Design a protein around this ligand. Sequence first.
Ligand SMILES: *[C@@H]1O[C@H](CO)[C@@H](O)[C@H](O)[C@H]1NC(C)=O
Lengths: 66, 49
Amino acid sequence: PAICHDGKAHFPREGVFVSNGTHWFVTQRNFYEPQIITTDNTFVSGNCDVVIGIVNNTVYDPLQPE
Amino acid sequence: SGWTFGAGPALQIPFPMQMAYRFNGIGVTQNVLYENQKLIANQFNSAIG
Ligand SMILES: *[C@@H]1O[C@H](CO)[C@@H](O)[C@H](O)[C@H]1NC(C)=O
């Protein structure tokens, strides 16, 4: 349901979180088209202690490298 | 399977995520459900009872 990066829960803006077995992606619901979980695809609202089923992973920031 | 079985092949999906989709369909963001999941369940169980 949600991905915890650093003490914060991230929910998909429009799509679902899927995994092939080793890595996590975000995709549509009616067609398979995986993408990289960045700060654009997701929005943050929470504290990483109330969602039942949260998992640990890393999101990517498109501004830190530049 | 949600509403998928009425259009094409049936596709399974966990119930809380289907409920999140149903909330998202009426204009309330899904994070409202997950942070108030247990409470909502109770309000359903009483309503049937
Ligand atoms: C997720 O990460 C946090 C902090 O790194 C850690 O405390 C917690 O045990 C981790 N949870 C799992 C299921 O690995």
